[PDB]
């Protein structure tokens, strides 16, 4: 005997991945960035730059 034509379905699921990268910034410099530790000189400004 003959045969009917076959159908089918299917699904494929995802998966999870991620990236990352550390960025550490220092102590003495975080004092100068925020202007807290900044002093009024012609030398502290250059170090902040």
């Amino acid at each position: 005997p003959a045969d009917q034509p076959v159908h089918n379905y299917m699904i494929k699921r995802l998966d999870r991945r991620s990236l990352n990268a550390a960025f550490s910034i220092a102590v003495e410099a975080l004092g100068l960035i925020s202007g807290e530790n900044l002093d009024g000189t012609h030398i502290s400004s250059a170090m902040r730059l």
């Binding site: 002093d39 009024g40 000189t41 030398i43």
Partner: protein, 49 residues
């Protein structure tokens, strides 16, 4: 109540002992120095000397 009696240094007599001066970057300063120049006189002897 009591009132505090303030005192100002330059009004004392002791100030004639030192030459004060501002220096707003003394915290950044490592060993600092000062130089002296001096040359002595001389007399021109005679005889065995």
């Amino acid at each position: 109540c009591s009132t505090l009696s303030l005192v100002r240094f330059l009004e004392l007599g002791l100030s004639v002992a030192c030459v004060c001066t501002k220096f707003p970057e003394l915290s950044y300063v490592a060993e600092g120095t000062i130089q002296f120049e001096v040359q002595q006189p001389m007399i021109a002897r005679d005889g065995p000397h």
